[PDB]
UniProtKB/TrEMBL annotation, chain A:
<dbReference type="GO" id="GO:0006367">
    <property type="term" value="P:transcription initiation at RNA polymerase II promoter"/>
</dbReference>
<feature type="binding site">
    <location>
        <position position="101"/>
    </location>
    <ligand>
        <name>Zn(2+) 2</name>
    </ligand>
</feature>
<feature type="binding site">
    <location>
        <position position="104"/>
    </location>
    <ligand>
        <name>Zn(2+) 12</name>
    </ligand>
</feature>
<feature type="binding site">
    <location>
        <position position="27"/>
    </location>
    <ligand>
        <name>Zn(2+) 2</name>
    </ligand>
</feature>
<feature type="binding site">
    <location>
        <position position="104"/>
    </location>
    <ligand>
        <name>Zn(2+) 9</name>
    </ligand>
</feature>
UniProtKB/TrEMBL annotation, chain B:
<comment type="similarity">
    <text>Belongs to the RNA polymerase beta' chain family.</text>
</comment>
<comment type="function">
    <text>DNA-dependent RNA polymerase catalyzes the transcription of DNA into RNA using the four ribonucleoside triphosphates as substrates.</text>
</comment>
<protein>
    <recommendedName>
        <fullName>DNA-directed RNA polymerase subunit</fullName>
    </recommendedName>
</protein>
UniProtKB/TrEMBL annotation, chain E:
<keyword id="KW-0804">Transcription</keyword>
<protein>
    <recommendedName>
        <fullName>Transcription elongation factor 1 homolog</fullName>
    </recommendedName>
</protein>
<dbReference type="GO" id="GO:0045815">
    <property type="term" value="P:transcription initiation-coupled chromatin remodeling"/>
</dbReference>
<comment type="function">
    <text>Transcription elongation factor implicated in the maintenance of proper chromatin structure in actively transcribed regions.</text>
</comment>
<comment type="similarity">
    <text>Belongs to the ELOF1 family.</text>
</comment>
UniProtKB/TrEMBL annotation, chain H:
<feature type="domain" description="RNA polymerase Rpb2">
    <location>
        <begin position="1"/>
        <end position="147"/>
    </location>
</feature>
<protein>
    <recommendedName>
        <fullName>DNA-directed RNA polymerase subunit beta</fullName>
    </recommendedName>
</protein>
<comment type="subunit">
    <text>Component of the RNA polymerase II (Pol II) complex consisting of 12 subunits.</text>
</comment>
<comment type="similarity">
    <text>Belongs to the RNA polymerase beta chain family.</text>
</comment>
<comment type="function">
    <text>DNA-dependent RNA polymerase catalyzes the transcription of DNA into RNA using the four ribonucleoside triphosphates as substrates.</text>
</comment>
Length: 111, 49, 85, 42, 64, 129, 49, 147, 49
């Protein structure tokens, strides 16, 4: 995640300081320079499994269109719960369904 | 039969069902008559053909 | 559907492990396959690193531009390709 | 009150038909056109 | 790579249309303009987002 | 959304007005456009607070009143619609709802005739709304 | 900084560990083939390919 | 709108817009700046709403990088007015105003046609581009045109 | 008999579903878990009919 300058509102561009040989966070339309906590500059992944458990909405318990289920709820121990599958459109999506309860809203896998 | 509606082929079925009938299996025959869902799946196939 | 009908050698044609070896050698492979995750670091120290995911590994391994080009590979996929990192 | 039979639905349909008719939407849009469209465009 | 542009732009001095030649030179981020009739030239910094139309706009903003 | 649903159900808002809430997308779209299409639907009362829960709002009283065609203190189709027993649905509205493909199907059922079509099992979800 | 990411992206693709290029995948296929037999008749023969 | 740049090809994953009565595409940041929000912080706010989505941030990053030359509404506008498909010789005097006109008029007229609600246009544009980026990530289904 | 066969086939399909959903259904060559699932289901239905 990349952030901007608080007062200049322009993007912080991390420029090296060879004299101290450290990482910084330097804007360009201003001169506000701040130290970089982690020497990481940019990070990118190849295999993505993020967003499968981050696409959660609270009011999902109020939808009747979704099927109900007697799948025992790990937390609320109810026997009337809905279940669905990840929203990811990747061709290789593995359909280990994200069973969701009326209350817990937890993406639990009982496998 | 695909999910022409969001996450389901028909509003009369729940979301995320996969039973044979739930995605376009006909169990009846013409003599037995066709329930509306299987009728519609057959109609889709015929239009396609 | 571009494809090739390939006939192996007589001994291989009746053999399976040799056939798999020949397939693996033939099937095209790249780092992207075995590559898993990449992480660009400004590692100021040419002689060491300030990231612990490899700190001990570099210490036992170590015994210019300071910016670090660090990446991760996929062991499961790496061995799927009959190769080691 | 009791369960709703099928002929209940058929008479439902008959009443709906008698109100609206087959050309209902046709006359509706034609009337709304003559009513509001002309002045709005003018 | 230099790109001579014998454009259709009309220059204000000799008032001849298609007399403006907008040769863009991004090497130094510095533009170049030429006329084949009165030989007037214009200068303006050129970012990665400047075009002969933008150059002509800068010329009008500068001369007049 | 419940409030506006009931608002249109009374007839306060035009039935043609389409009201769609997207739970997953955290979106709420309302349409009142010309050129939209719609078809009627029975309203299965689904509130978990009364007997009509999972049951039709329409009743044989409305049937009698229509057979009269008058109101027993004109009682027409639009009267049924306005009373809140009958709603339309456009193509997009059809998606976010669960309909009972037959009046029988509203009540969860409990035979073996070779001269008839076959109804669905409907067992994957022990609960229906 | 930008040079480092350019190098990262450049290497991400331009390193082929093994295999003939242009071959996304290969399949281990078995094959039956009629084979003349020593006595003179023909014998089919399951064989990898 | 269109997601310029291919996956690690075409340089960054940039985006440029297509407009009525124009002849060229423009970086999306530029049209944001000509509409009032020159800073990229407001642009990202109106566009990205889950800052945790660093992936969104880095797909838009080339768009942000390329959006540093324009820093105010007038340069963004004359820039835009330079590509307004109009005649030759409008000069910055009227070019900026014509650009602002086409930013207001001919642009999302169904949203607003008067002044003072270009902020509404910015918010709606940010939402639309957010949908575009979600689709590029393909975390959601492409809107079935047959629906 | 037809109904018993249909019940058995639908049971096969349901067991295939329980198989795939618990991340237990084997992958077909060059054909995804979703695509393998679809193929197995289709084969089961063809066998049933
Ligand atoms: Zn700044
Ligand atoms: Zn629960
Ligand atoms: Zn001249």
């Amino acid at each position: 995640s990349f952030r901007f300058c608080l007062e200049c509102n322009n993007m912080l561009y991390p420029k090296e300081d060879k004299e101290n040989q450290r990482l910084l966070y330097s804007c360009r339309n201003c001169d506000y320079t701040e130290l970089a906590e982690d020497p990481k500059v940019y990070r990118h992944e190849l295999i993505t499994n993020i967003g499968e458990t981050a696409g959660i909405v609270d009011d999902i318990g109020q939808d009747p269109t979704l099927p109900r289920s007697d799948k025992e709820c790990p937390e609320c121990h109810s026997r009337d719960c809905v279940f669905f599958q990840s929203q990811q459109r990747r061709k290789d999506t593995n359909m280990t369904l994200f069973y969701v309860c009326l209350n817990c809203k937890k993406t639990f896998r009982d496998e | 039969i695909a999910f022409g509606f969001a996450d389901r082929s028909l509003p009369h079925f729940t979301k995320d069902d996969f039973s044979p009938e739930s995605k376009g299996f006909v169990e009846n025959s013409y003599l037995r008559g066709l329930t509306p869902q299987e009728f519609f799946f057959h109609a889709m196939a015929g239009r396609e053909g | 559907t571009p494809a090739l009908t390939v006939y192996l050698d007589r001994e291989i044609a009746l053999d399976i492990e040799k056939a798999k070896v020949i397939q693996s050698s033939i099937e095209y492979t790249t780092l992207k396959n075995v590559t898993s995750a990449t992480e660009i670091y400004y590692d100021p120290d040419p002689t060491s690193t300030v990231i612990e995911e490899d700190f001990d590994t570099v210490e036992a391994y170590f015994s210019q531009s300071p910016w670090l080009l660090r990446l991760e590979l996929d062991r499961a996929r790496m061995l799927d390709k009959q190769l080691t990192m | 009150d009791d369960t709703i039979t099928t002929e209940d639905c058929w008479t439902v349909i008959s009443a709906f038909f008698e109100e609206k008719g087959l050309v209902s939407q046709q006359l509706d849009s034609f009337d709304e056109f003559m009513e509001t469209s002309i002045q709005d465009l003018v | 790579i230099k790109q001579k542009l014998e454009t259709q732009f009309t220059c204000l001095f000799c008032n001849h249309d298609n007399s403006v030649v907008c040769t863009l030179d991004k090497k130094n981020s510095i533009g170049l303009l030429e006329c084949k009739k009165c030989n007037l030239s214009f200068q303006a910094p050129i970012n990665s987002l400047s075009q002969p139309i933008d150059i002509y706009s800068d010329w009008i903003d500068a001369c007049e | 959304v419940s409030t506006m649903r009931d608002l249109r159900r009374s007839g306060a808002i035009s039935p043609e007005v389409s009201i769609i809430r997207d739970i997953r997308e955290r979106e709420f779209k309302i349409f009142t456009d010309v050129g939209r299409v719609y078809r009627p639907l029975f309203i299965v009362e689904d509130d978990e607070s009364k007997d009509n829960k999972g049951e039709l709002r329409i009743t044989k009283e409305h049937i009698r009143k229509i057979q009269q065609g008058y109101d027993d203190d004109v009682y027409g189709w639009s009267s049924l619609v306005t009373s809140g027993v009958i709603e339309y649905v456009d193509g997009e509205e059809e998606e976010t709802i669960m309909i009972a493909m037959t009046p029988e199907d509203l009540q969860t059922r409990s035979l073996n005739d070779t001269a008839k079509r076959i109804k669905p099992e409907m067992s994957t979800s022990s609960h229906h709304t | 900084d930008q040079m480092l990411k350019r190098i990262e992206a450049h290497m991400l693709d331009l390193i082929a560990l093994r295999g003939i290029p242009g071959i996304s995948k290969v399949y281990m296929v078995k094959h039956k083939v009629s084979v003349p037999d020593e006595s003179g008749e023909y014998k089919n023969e399951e064989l990898w390919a | 709108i269109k997601l310029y740049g291919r996956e690690d090809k075409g340089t960054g994953r940039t985006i440029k817009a297509t407009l009525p009565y124009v002849k060229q595409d423009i970086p999306i940041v530029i049209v944001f700046r000509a509409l009032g929000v020159v800073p990229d912080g407001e642009i990202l706010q109106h566009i990205c709403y889950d800052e945790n989505d660093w992936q969104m941030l880095e797909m838009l990053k080339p768009c942000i990088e390329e959006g540093f030359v324009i820093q105010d509404k007038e340069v963004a506008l004359d820039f835009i007015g330079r590509r307004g498909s109009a005649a030759l010789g409008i000069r910055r005097e009227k070019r900026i105003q014509y650009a602002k006109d086409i930013l207001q008029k001919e642009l999302l007229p169904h949203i607003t046609q008067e002044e003072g609600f270009e902020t509404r246009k910015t918010f709606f544009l940010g939402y639309m581009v957010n949908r575009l980026l979600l689709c590029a990530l393909e975390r959601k289904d492409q809107d079935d045109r047959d629906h | 008999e037809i109904t018993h066969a249909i019940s058995s086939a639908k049971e096969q399909v349901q067991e295939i579903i329980y198989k795939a959903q618990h991340n237990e259904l084997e992958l077909k060559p060059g054909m995804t878990l979703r695509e393998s699932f679809e193929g197995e289901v289709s084969r089961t239905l063809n066998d049933a009919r």
